[PDB]
């Protein structure tokens, strides 16, 4: 090992790594990418191996320092602790509902209105009812007899389609 040696006689430090899996809990593993956390959006969340799809909002549940997950009565994960920053997030499920079409007879008219049940109007002639978001019906302050039932005291009729 003199410095004037040619390549093939020069000293080479060699490290050999041997990896093995046994009948034991495995613990050496590569780092897992932790992306930025976003809120108030319907995303596919993956918290420490717990996967799913839901809107992650800020939570008022004060967890104990050892507890990580949160379940309701029906064994669905509705709360989680972020591992990066020690904070609590609620998982509301992503917005879903039925899509119903309110129409008069096709002999009368071809105008329709669309009811998105249990859906807020900001994430779908747009009117917010307790039954859901109603698009295509003009809301009036006058009260009439129920022609087409919408629900929660709301009814639709044709005169354009009014609700």
């Amino acid at each position: 090992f003199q410095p004037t040696y040619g390549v093939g006689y020069q000293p080479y430090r060699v490290v050999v790594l041997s990896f093995e899996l046994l009948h034991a809990p495995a613990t050496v593993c590569g780092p897992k990418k932790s992306t930025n956390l976003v809120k108030n959006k319907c995303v596919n969340f993956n918290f420490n191996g717990l996967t799913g799809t839901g809107v992650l909002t800020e939570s008022n549940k004060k967890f104990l320092p050892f507890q990580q997950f949160g379940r309701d009565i029906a064994d669905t994960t509705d709360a989680v602790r972020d591992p990066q920053t020690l904070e609590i997030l609620d998982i509301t499920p992503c917005s879903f509902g039925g899509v119903s079409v309110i129409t008069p007879g096709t002999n009368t008219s071809n105008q329709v209105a669309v009811l998105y049940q249990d859906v807020n109007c900001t994430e779908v002639n747009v009117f917010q009812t307790r039954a859901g978001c109603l698009i295509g019906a003009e809301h009036v302050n006058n009260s009439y007899e129920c022609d087409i039932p919408i629900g929660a005291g709301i009814c639709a009729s044709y005169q354009s389609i009014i609700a």
Partner: protein
């Protein structure tokens, strides 16, 4: 509605036709901080290495290992892996690593 009721004429009323399932926008993966990293600097950047008749063996366990820094280091004249890949090394969890 005409396709749902299987008719070209629709009577007056409300007819449930479909479902509005909001689609997920992004994917968020959150994991704890990378801490208790493996002592690869104690093996690789040692001041004096052993001789080959008395080769040092170091048991490695309970740590997270970044092989991507080792692969991305251009100072290594030889990097041969015979049953794994660097992406596989990042995605396989192993019980024991013997250096």
């Amino acid at each position: 509605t005409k396709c749902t009721l299987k008719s070209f004429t629709v009577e007056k009323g409300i007819y449930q036709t479909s479902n509005f399932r909001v689609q997920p926008t992004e994917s968020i993966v959150r994991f704890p901080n990378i801490t208790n990293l493996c002592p690869f600097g104690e093996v690789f950047n040692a001041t004096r290495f052993a001789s080959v008749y008395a080769w040092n063996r170091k048991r490695i366990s309970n740590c997270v290992a970044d092989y991507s820094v080792l692969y991305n280091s251009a100072s290594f004249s030889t990097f041969k892996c015979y049953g794994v890949s660097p992406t596989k090394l990042n995605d396989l969890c192993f019980t024991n690593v013997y250096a």
